[PDB]
Amino acid sequence: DDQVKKIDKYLYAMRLSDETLIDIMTRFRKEMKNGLSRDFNPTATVKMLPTFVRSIPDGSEKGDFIALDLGGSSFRILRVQVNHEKNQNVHMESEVYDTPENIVHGSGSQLFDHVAECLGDFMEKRKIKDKKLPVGFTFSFPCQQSKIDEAILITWTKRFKASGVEGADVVKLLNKAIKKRGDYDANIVAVVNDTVGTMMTCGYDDQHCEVGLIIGTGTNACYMEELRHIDLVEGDEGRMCINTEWGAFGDDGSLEDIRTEFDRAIDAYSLNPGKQLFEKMVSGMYLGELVRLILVKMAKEGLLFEGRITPELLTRGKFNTSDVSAIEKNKEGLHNAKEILTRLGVEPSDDDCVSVQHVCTIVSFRSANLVAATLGAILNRLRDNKGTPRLRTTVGVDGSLYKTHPQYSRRFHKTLRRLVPDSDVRFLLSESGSGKGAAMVTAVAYRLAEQHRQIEETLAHFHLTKDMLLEVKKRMRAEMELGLRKQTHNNAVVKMLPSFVRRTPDGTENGDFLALDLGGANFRVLLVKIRSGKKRTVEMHNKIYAIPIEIMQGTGEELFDHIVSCISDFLDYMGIKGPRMPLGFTFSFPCQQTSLDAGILITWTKGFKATDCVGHDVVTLLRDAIKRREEFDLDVVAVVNDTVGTMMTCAYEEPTCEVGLIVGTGSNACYMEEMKNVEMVEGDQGQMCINMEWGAFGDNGCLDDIRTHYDRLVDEYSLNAGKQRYEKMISGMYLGEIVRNILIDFTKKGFLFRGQISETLKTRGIFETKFLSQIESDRLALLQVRAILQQLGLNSTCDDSILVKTVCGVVSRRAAQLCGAGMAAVVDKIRENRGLDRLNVTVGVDGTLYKLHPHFSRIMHQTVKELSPKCNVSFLLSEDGSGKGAALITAVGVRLRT
Numbered sequence: 001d002d003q004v005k006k007i008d009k010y011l012y013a014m015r016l017s018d019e020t021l022i023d024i025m026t027r028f029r030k031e032m033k034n035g036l037s038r039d040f041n042p043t044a045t046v047k048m049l050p051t052f053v054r055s056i057p058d059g060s061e062k063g064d065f066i067a068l069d070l071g072g073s074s075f076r077i078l079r080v081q082v083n084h085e086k087n088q089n090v091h092m093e094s095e096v097y098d099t100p101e102n103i104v105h106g107s108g109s110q111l112f113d114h115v116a117e118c119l120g121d122f123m124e125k126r127k128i129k130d131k132k133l134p135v136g137f138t139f140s141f142p143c144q145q146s147k148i149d150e151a152i153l154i155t156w157t158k159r160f161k162a163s164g165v166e167g168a169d170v171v172k173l174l175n176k177a178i179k180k181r182g183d184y185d186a187n188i189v190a191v192v193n194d195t196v197g198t199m200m201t202c203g204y205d206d207q208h209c210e211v212g213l214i215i216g217t218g219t220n221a222c223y224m225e226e227l228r229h230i231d232l233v234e235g236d237e238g239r240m241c242i243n244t245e246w247g248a249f250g251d252d253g254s255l256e257d258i259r260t261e262f263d264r265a266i267d268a269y270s271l272n273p274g275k276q277l278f279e280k281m282v283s284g285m286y287l288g289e290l291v292r293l294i295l296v297k298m299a300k301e302g303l304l305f306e307g308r309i310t311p312e313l314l315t316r317g318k319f320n321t322s323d324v325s326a327i328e329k330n331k332e333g334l335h336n337a338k339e340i341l342t343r344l345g346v347e348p349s350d351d352d353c354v355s356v357q358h359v360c361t362i363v364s365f366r367s368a369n370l371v372a373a374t375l376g377a378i379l380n381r382l383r384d385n386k387g388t389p390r391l392r393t394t395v396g397v398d399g400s401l402y403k404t405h406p407q408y409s410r411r412f413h414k415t416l417r418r419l420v421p422d423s424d425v426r427f428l429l430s431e432s433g434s435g436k437g438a439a440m441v442t443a444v445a446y447r448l449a450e451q452h453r454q455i456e457e458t459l460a461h462f463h464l465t466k467d468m469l470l471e472v473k474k475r476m477r478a479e480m481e482l483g484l485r486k487q488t489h490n491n492a493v494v495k496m497l498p499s500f501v502r503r504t505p506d507g508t509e510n511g512d513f514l515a516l517d518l519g520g521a522n523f524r525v526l527l528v529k530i531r532s533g534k535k536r537t538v539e540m541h542n543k544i545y546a547i548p549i550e551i552m553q554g555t556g557e558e559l560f561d562h563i564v565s566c567i568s569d570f571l572d573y574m575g576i577k578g579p580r581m582p583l584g585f586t587f588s589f590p591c592q593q594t595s596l597d598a599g600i601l602i603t604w605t606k607g608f609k610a611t612d613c614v615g616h617d618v619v620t621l622l623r624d625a626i627k628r629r630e631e632f633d634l635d636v637v638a639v640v641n642d643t644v645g646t647m648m649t650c651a652y653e654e655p656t657c658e659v660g661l662i663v664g665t666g667s668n669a670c671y672m673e674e675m676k677n678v679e680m681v682e683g684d685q686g687q688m689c690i691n692m693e694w695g696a697f698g699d700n701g702c703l704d705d706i707r708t709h710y711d712r713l714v715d716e717y718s719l720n721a722g723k724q725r726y727e728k729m730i731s732g733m734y735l736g737e738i739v740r741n742i743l744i745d746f747t748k749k750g751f752l753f754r755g756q757i758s759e760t761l762k763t764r765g766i767f768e769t770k771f772l773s774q775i776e777s778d779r780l781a782l783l784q785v786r787a788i789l790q791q792l793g794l795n796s797t798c799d800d801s802i803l804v805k806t807v808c809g810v811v812s813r814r815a816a817q818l819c820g821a822g823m824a825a826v827v828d829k830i831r832e833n834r835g836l837d838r839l840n841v842t843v844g845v846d847g848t849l850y851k852l853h854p855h856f857s858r859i860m861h862q863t864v865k866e867l868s869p870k871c872n873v874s875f876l877l878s879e880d881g882s883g884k885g886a887a888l889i890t891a892v893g894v895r896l897r898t
């Protein structure tokens with residue numbers, strides 16, 4: 001009773017109470033929250049690192065893996081087969097590799113060369129060098145991880161201290177060392193902390209396992225947190241294992257009232273002074289040394305060995321944690337004490353043995369009590385997250401100390417259960433080591449890496465390099481030349497059609513005009529009033545009319561009768577009476593014009609297919625339909641492409657506007673060409689607006705090297721298969737179908753929607769590009785991308801939505817770069833043709849995809865700037881539509897009759 005009582009007094013501060021433990025538990029509860037917070041994380045001592053392991057095993061894991069295990073008391077390499085054969089969950093084989101102090105304390109290169117070598121030897125011996133076994137790495141040190149296959153070493157701890165590793169991705173260093181060998185290939189697909197491996201190993205057996213605990217060389221814990229509490233990981237969806245790195249608790253000085261002189265001593269002479277302070281009161285690397293420091297002070301005070309002090313006793317590290325364990329054994333402890341102390345150079349008495357045993361008890365029990373306190377905090381946190389009165393959970397544990405001390409685990413469990421009386425906790429020893437667990441992570445990581453690889457390979461076909469874009473630019477220029485030249489115009493796919501509009505607005509136009517706008521999303525009839533002079537004005541009125549697909553694809557007589565019926569209506573709607581008014585017809589299809597007011601339809605594009613129209617003058621068609629109605633009369637003065645109307649609308653105010661662009665249902669462009677270059681039109685004086693009909697670029701195969709399997713599909717299922725190829729990679733009518741076809745392929749490969757091709761995904765048109773703009777600028781819940789995808793009819797996961805958003809982006813980005821390259825050809829032709837060093841030019845633009853898409857216009861302007869650097873291009877969106885410009889065209893037309 002005496003001795004122990006006095007020893008209790010001497011080490012009174014090492015013998016913590018339940019009140020103190022509860023205090024410590026509450027301090028740890030607060031550090032966990034700081035760790036997880038985006039505000040305090042940078043200055044949190046308990047790092048709460050995301051591990052990217054979002055579940056314990058589910059039973060679907062299967063494969064043949066290699067697992068490395070570095071950082072604990074032994075460096076191990078294992079080959080782990082999981083459900084690789086029926087009636088054998090797991091099968092394991094292992095090897096320990098001697099890794100002396102000079103490697104652990106030397107250079108990083110030397111360290112990772114050593115790991116690569118042992119891995120080589122391991123594969124060599126088992127002849128598995130060609131099996132392509134995915135590798136998992138258990139690396140028990142704090143790491144910064146943004147994905148499962150990256151591990152940026154934050155700080156060395158425990159016995160390791162190799163230069164050049166802190167701040168480096170150890171996957172990359174390990175890859176580098178293996179490459180240097182040149183002996184074999186190794187696919188490192190996952191890195192995990194040993195706490196995480198333990199949790200996964202135990203989780204494979206028990207589905208209630210939510211915590212991984214190590215009490216070995218060092219100490220740490222991981223547990224399953226809710227994504228909504230993990231501020232540094234995007235998403236509020238589900239759970240993710242957090243590696244607490246609890247050894248660093250108190251590094252800021254918050255446990256200074258618990259720490260003793262002994263703690264301070266061991267810390268000051270360790271490899272990492274002032275770091276991992278909590279761990280230094282708890283783990284196997286330090287307990288023996290704490291005991292030795294206490295025995296030295298006691299000896300010095302003549303409380304032990306009659307003051308005898310040997311140099312062996314004074315040698316740091318000479319009394320290890322194994323000695324503590326031996327000494328605390330029930331029957332042989334005192335005897336072991338005797339032998340152990342006898343070897344210290346002393347001649348310990350029997351009382352000395354009892355005293356030393358008690359010092360070992362106090363040190364090892366304080367450790368157990370401390371870990372109980374911190375684990376209690378994690379258990380309370382889980383209980384709060386689950387929201388129930390009682391907590392049922394399994395803690396998987398590993399570590400030499402916990403496995404070999406004769407009393408520790410018992411005492412730790414007891415105290416833990418006392419401190420968290422609301423929990424029903426099971427402790428499951430991890431008898432197979434971290435490797436089994438690592439393998440389970442590895443299996444999942446490997447499966448996902450294979451899916452990502454295939455998705456990337458598919459999407460890479462849509463990526464266009466700058467050089468590729470410069471080549472598209474070059475080809476567009478080449479086709480422009482072909483269409484403008486007499487010799488080659490007839491077999492040129494980019495027709496370069498004269499519009500018979502020879503100048504931009506001169507400011508004198510004025511009058512009241514009617515105009516039609518046919519071919520885009522909305523058919524419209526307009527009334528436009530233009531007034532010049534002191535303060536010019538334009539006044540416009542319009543009405544949209546529907547054109548059912550049966551009339552768009554019925555007979556020309558029916559289509560024009562419909563147009564005439566809508567004009568009739570609009571005249572009544574506006575109260576237009578009096579003499580026949582001039583009218584400008586914007587008809588957005590390729591026409592061969594012989595004059596402003598004559599235009600023979602060359603082919604239908606987009607969704608129109610009315611019969612007896614192709615090869616007819618559409619002004620004549622309109623004129624005929626007005627005569628059939630025999631009511632109003634009209635003076636059709638002009639037939640105009642929408643590109644050309646758009647340009648004129650923008651050039652009303654901008655003298656630099658000499659280009660028109662449409663990116664809506666279809667895509668096309670127009671620009672002012674010099675008459676000397678327009679060889680299909682007699683005259684070499686002045687300019688002429690040319691309707692490129694650029695949609696058809698590629699119809700001769702010139703873009704076959706960039707069209708993908710999905711482009712081919714869209715064209716093959718289209719109304720005009722083989723035609724308008726360039727347009728089909730850019731415009732509104734087509735991007736949605738490119739996306740849809742990519743989604744279907746990914747769903748069949750099992751990368752999206754659970755492998756379910758929902759009858760509405762199999763339905764063409766459903767990926768409207770209306771929803772393409774919507775999906776491409778979202779929320780963070782992507783809760784937006786969900787209602788879009790569900791309304792139609794599938795059921796996303798947040799992983800799902802993401803993929804859908806990425807696919808959309810790849811398609812729209814390529815569309816805008818393609819569009820850019822064509823525009824880069826047009827402005828550099830204008831520049832180069834006028835002999836200028838730089839060209840300041842405005843492009844009047846319109847179209848629904850251009851107007852509504854969040855990134856199209858930006859990406860496209862950037863491309864133009866990169867591909868034609870000596871041109872400074874301003875893109876001005878029309879507010880008014882083609883109407884103001886069709887009216888201006890009509891005014892000049894009237895004027896030119898006189």
Ligand SMILES: Nc1ncnc2c1ncn2[C@@H]1O[C@H](COP(=O)(O)OP(=O)(O)O)[C@@H](O)[C@H]1O
Pocket residue numbers: 014015016017358361362363365366369407411
């Ligand atoms: N909070 C504590 N901190 C340190 N040592 C303690 C503490 N509580 C009890 N002890 C010591 O632990 C021992 C009791 O061990 P315990 O596990 O409860 O019973 P047993 O003797 O079977 O191991 C005694 O040596 C006692 O002085």
Ligand SMILES: Nc1ncnc2c1ncn2[C@@H]1O[C@H](COP(=O)(O)OP(=O)(O)O)[C@@H](O)[C@H]1O
Pocket residue numbers: 519520521522523663664665666731732733734768769770771772773774846847848849850852853
């Ligand atoms: N939110 C959107 N994002 C991108 N493109 C869209 C969006 N909504 C509609 N579109 C596309 O815009 C096109 C129509 O534009 P346009 O040809 O100029 O017709 P209009 O202006 O007369 O309505 C369609 O092909 C449609 O798929």
Ligand SMILES: OC[C@H]1O[C@H](O)[C@H](O)[C@@H](O)[C@@H]1O
Pocket residue numbers: 071072139140141142157158193194195214216217218219220221245247276279
């Ligand atoms: O090996 C046990 C623990 O040792 C240390 O404290 C390391 O920081 C931690 O990464 C590890 O989990």
Ligand SMILES: OC[C@H]1O[C@H](O)[C@H](O)[C@@H](O)[C@@H]1O
Pocket residue numbers: 519520587588589590605606641642643662665666667668669693695727
């Ligand atoms: O409406 C935009 C474009 O769609 C198509 O490409 C039509 O051929 C073209 O004439 C029109 O400019």
